[PDB]
Amino acid sequence: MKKYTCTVCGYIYNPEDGDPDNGVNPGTDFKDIPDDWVCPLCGAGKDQFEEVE
Amino acid sequence: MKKYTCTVCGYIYNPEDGDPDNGVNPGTDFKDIPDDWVCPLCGAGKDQFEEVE
Amino acid sequence: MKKYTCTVCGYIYNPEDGDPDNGVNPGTDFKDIPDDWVCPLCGAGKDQFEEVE
Ligand SMILES: [Fe+3]
Ligand SMILES: [Fe+3]
Ligand SMILES: [Fe+3]
């Protein structure tokens, strides 16, 4: 699975880690995260993220 | 022609339906969509899409 | 690289120009701007910016 970065603050969503404290379990692909989830560090929406590659 | 999904919001581009409101007619293969077209639901570019399955 | 717009005042961050007098050199992608940088016209943080197309 691909990592994604928050364009507003640079937070990296790592699929292996997930974001469990906000209900995104380890191993969740970014496309499968609920579309109301926001960046844990700056509150930016998913639409402000892009693939690392 | 295969379906493609926006990995940022989960939108599925289906070639049989196209995206006629933004000038992408039914029968347009994903690679042939004008490269300035974005995801109708979250504004992500074609570079954030992935072939389904 | 994508241009970003300040939703508070309309200032456009252009990656090719950067914002050199506030330490952001030409060629800096918005996601790589240090997170304490603000819009030079209105003081808005990076969180008030949105990608243009
Ligand atoms: Fe963020
Ligand atoms: Fe999308
Ligand atoms: Fe501003």
PDB file of all heavy atoms in Angstrom, chain C residues 22-35:
ATOM      1  N   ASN C  22      10.416  35.760   2.492  1.00  0.00           N
ATOM      2  CA  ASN C  22      10.015  35.106   3.723  1.00  0.00           C
ATOM      3  C   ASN C  22      10.596  33.695   3.850  1.00  0.00           C
ATOM      4  O   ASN C  22      10.089  32.839   4.579  1.00  0.00           O
ATOM      5  CB  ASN C  22       8.498  35.091   3.785  1.00  0.00           C
ATOM      6  CG  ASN C  22       7.969  36.518   3.812  1.00  0.00           C
ATOM      7  OD1 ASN C  22       8.073  37.197   4.827  1.00  0.00           O
ATOM      8  ND2 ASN C  22       7.429  37.035   2.715  1.00  0.00           N
ATOM      9  N   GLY C  23      11.708  33.468   3.128  1.00  0.00           N
ATOM     10  CA  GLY C  23      12.489  32.241   3.199  1.00  0.00           C
ATOM     11  C   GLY C  23      12.028  31.051   2.384  1.00  0.00           C
ATOM     12  O   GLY C  23      12.522  29.955   2.620  1.00  0.00           O
ATOM     13  N   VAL C  24      11.095  31.218   1.450  1.00  0.00           N
ATOM     14  CA  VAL C  24      10.632  30.104   0.631  1.00  0.00           C
ATOM     15  C   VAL C  24      11.194  30.333  -0.769  1.00  0.00           C
ATOM     16  O   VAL C  24      10.744  31.187  -1.530  1.00  0.00           O
ATOM     17  CB  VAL C  24       9.072  30.055   0.631  1.00  0.00           C
ATOM     18  CG1 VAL C  24       8.616  28.884  -0.218  1.00  0.00           C
ATOM     19  CG2 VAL C  24       8.520  29.865   2.032  1.00  0.00           C
ATOM     20  N   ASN C  25      12.222  29.554  -1.109  1.00  0.00           N
ATOM     21  CA  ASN C  25      12.900  29.727  -2.376  1.00  0.00           C
ATOM     22  C   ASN C  25      12.050  29.309  -3.560  1.00  0.00           C
ATOM     23  O   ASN C  25      11.127  28.504  -3.393  1.00  0.00           O
ATOM     24  CB  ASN C  25      14.211  28.934  -2.337  1.00  0.00           C
ATOM     25  CG  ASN C  25      15.214  29.528  -1.348  1.00  0.00           C
ATOM     26  OD1 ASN C  25      14.895  30.425  -0.565  1.00  0.00           O
ATOM     27  ND2 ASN C  25      16.451  29.053  -1.364  1.00  0.00           N
ATOM     28  N   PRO C  26      12.297  29.851  -4.761  1.00  0.00           N
ATOM     29  CA  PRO C  26      11.715  29.394  -6.022  1.00  0.00           C
ATOM     30  C   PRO C  26      11.863  27.887  -6.172  1.00  0.00           C
ATOM     31  O   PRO C  26      12.890  27.310  -5.802  1.00  0.00           O
ATOM     32  CB  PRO C  26      12.461  30.171  -7.080  1.00  0.00           C
ATOM     33  CG  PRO C  26      12.763  31.449  -6.374  1.00  0.00           C
ATOM     34  CD  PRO C  26      13.185  30.987  -5.007  1.00  0.00           C
ATOM     35  N   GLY C  27      10.803  27.248  -6.664  1.00  0.00           N
ATOM     36  CA  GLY C  27      10.801  25.810  -6.845  1.00  0.00           C
ATOM     37  C   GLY C  27      10.325  25.049  -5.623  1.00  0.00           C
ATOM     38  O   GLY C  27      10.404  23.821  -5.633  1.00  0.00           O
ATOM     39  N   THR C  28       9.837  25.702  -4.555  1.00  0.00           N
ATOM     40  CA  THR C  28       9.369  24.966  -3.384  1.00  0.00           C
ATOM     41  C   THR C  28       7.905  24.595  -3.535  1.00  0.00           C
ATOM     42  O   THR C  28       7.027  25.430  -3.745  1.00  0.00           O
ATOM     43  CB  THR C  28       9.530  25.788  -2.089  1.00  0.00           C
ATOM     44  OG1 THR C  28      10.897  26.167  -2.011  1.00  0.00           O
ATOM     45  CG2 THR C  28       9.180  24.997  -0.831  1.00  0.00           C
ATOM     46  N   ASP C  29       7.671  23.290  -3.451  1.00  0.00           N
ATOM     47  CA  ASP C  29       6.330  22.744  -3.488  1.00  0.00           C
ATOM     48  C   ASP C  29       5.643  23.218  -2.210  1.00  0.00           C
ATOM     49  O   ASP C  29       6.269  23.277  -1.148  1.00  0.00           O
ATOM     50  CB  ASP C  29       6.415  21.218  -3.513  1.00  0.00           C
ATOM     51  CG  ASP C  29       5.132  20.495  -3.881  1.00  0.00           C
ATOM     52  OD1 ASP C  29       4.152  20.565  -3.137  1.00  0.00           O
ATOM     53  OD2 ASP C  29       5.117  19.834  -4.914  1.00  0.00           O
ATOM     54  N   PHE C  30       4.359  23.566  -2.296  1.00  0.00           N
ATOM     55  CA  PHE C  30       3.607  23.985  -1.119  1.00  0.00           C
ATOM     56  C   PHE C  30       3.713  23.004   0.051  1.00  0.00           C
ATOM     57  O   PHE C  30       3.832  23.434   1.193  1.00  0.00           O
ATOM     58  CB  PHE C  30       2.149  24.168  -1.520  1.00  0.00           C
ATOM     59  CG  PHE C  30       1.277  24.771  -0.432  1.00  0.00           C
ATOM     60  CD1 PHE C  30       1.289  26.151  -0.240  1.00  0.00           C
ATOM     61  CD2 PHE C  30       0.484  23.943   0.370  1.00  0.00           C
ATOM     62  CE1 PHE C  30       0.504  26.707   0.766  1.00  0.00           C
ATOM     63  CE2 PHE C  30      -0.300  24.509   1.373  1.00  0.00           C
ATOM     64  CZ  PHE C  30      -0.289  25.889   1.572  1.00  0.00           C
ATOM     65  N   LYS C  31       3.710  21.688  -0.198  1.00  0.00           N
ATOM     66  CA  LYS C  31       3.792  20.720   0.883  1.00  0.00           C
ATOM     67  C   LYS C  31       5.127  20.762   1.618  1.00  0.00           C
ATOM     68  O   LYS C  31       5.232  20.284   2.742  1.00  0.00           O
ATOM     69  CB  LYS C  31       3.560  19.308   0.346  1.00  0.00           C
ATOM     70  CG  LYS C  31       4.712  18.696  -0.420  1.00  0.00           C
ATOM     71  CD  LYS C  31       4.331  17.337  -0.983  1.00  0.00           C
ATOM     72  CE  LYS C  31       5.569  16.599  -1.502  1.00  0.00           C
ATOM     73  NZ  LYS C  31       6.239  17.322  -2.573  1.00  0.00           N
ATOM     74  N   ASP C  32       6.155  21.352   0.997  1.00  0.00           N
ATOM     75  CA  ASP C  32       7.468  21.472   1.607  1.00  0.00           C
ATOM     76  C   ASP C  32       7.746  22.825   2.237  1.00  0.00           C
ATOM     77  O   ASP C  32       8.818  23.029   2.808  1.00  0.00           O
ATOM     78  CB  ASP C  32       8.523  21.152   0.549  1.00  0.00           C
ATOM     79  CG  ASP C  32       8.473  19.692   0.101  1.00  0.00           C
ATOM     80  OD1 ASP C  32       8.207  18.812   0.924  1.00  0.00           O
ATOM     81  OD2 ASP C  32       8.695  19.438  -1.080  1.00  0.00           O
ATOM     82  N   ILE C  33       6.806  23.776   2.144  1.00  0.00           N
ATOM     83  CA  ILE C  33       6.931  25.061   2.818  1.00  0.00           C
ATOM     84  C   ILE C  33       6.942  24.774   4.324  1.00  0.00           C
ATOM     85  O   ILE C  33       6.094  24.010   4.790  1.00  0.00           O
ATOM     86  CB  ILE C  33       5.739  25.967   2.440  1.00  0.00           C
ATOM     87  CG1 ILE C  33       5.817  26.354   0.976  1.00  0.00           C
ATOM     88  CG2 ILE C  33       5.745  27.214   3.300  1.00  0.00           C
ATOM     89  CD1 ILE C  33       4.650  27.251   0.527  1.00  0.00           C
ATOM     90  N   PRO C  34       7.862  25.313   5.147  1.00  0.00           N
ATOM     91  CA  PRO C  34       7.817  25.164   6.591  1.00  0.00           C
ATOM     92  C   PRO C  34       6.464  25.608   7.138  1.00  0.00           C
ATOM     93  O   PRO C  34       5.855  26.588   6.701  1.00  0.00           O
ATOM     94  CB  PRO C  34       9.005  25.970   7.068  1.00  0.00           C
ATOM     95  CG  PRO C  34       9.277  26.915   5.937  1.00  0.00           C
ATOM     96  CD  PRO C  34       9.064  26.030   4.732  1.00  0.00           C
ATOM     97  N   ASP C  35       5.969  24.791   8.064  1.00  0.00           N
ATOM     98  CA  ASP C  35       4.619  24.957   8.574  1.00  0.00           C
ATOM     99  C   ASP C  35       4.324  26.171   9.411  1.00  0.00           C
ATOM    100  O   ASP C  35       3.179  26.370   9.825  1.00  0.00           O
ATOM    101  CB  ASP C  35       4.248  23.714   9.349  1.00  0.00           C
ATOM    102  CG  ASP C  35       3.980  22.475   8.506  1.00  0.00           C
ATOM    103  OD1 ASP C  35       3.767  22.570   7.290  1.00  0.00           O
ATOM    104  OD2 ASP C  35       4.011  21.397   9.095  1.00  0.00           O
TER     105      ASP C  35
END
